[PDB]
């Protein structure tokens, strides 16, 4: 399995176990004075995160491209 991977935007492959990639966005307290944040990475499920923060979770090659802004 092969996610897109921050802070590079290079896809990798994922370690063993790992097979979902992910992209997730943080605009929290900060975000209106230096903006959005975004991990992209590969995790053996999909991360739980708090108010503040949106996920995507998928199970496919590369399927966590960088968002457009």
Partial sequence: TKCYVTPDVKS???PAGQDICYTETWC???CTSRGKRVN???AATCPIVKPG??????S???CNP????
Avoid at 53 to 58: G, N, R
Avoid at 66 to 69: D, I, S, V
């Fill in 12 to 14: 990798e492959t994922c």
């Fill in 28 to 30: 929290d307290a900060w």
């Fill in 40 to 42: 992209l990475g590969c």
């Fill in 53 to 58: 923060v949106e996920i995507k979770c998928c």
């Fill in 60 to 62: 496919t090659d590369n």
């Fill in 66 to 69: 960088f968002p457009t802004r």
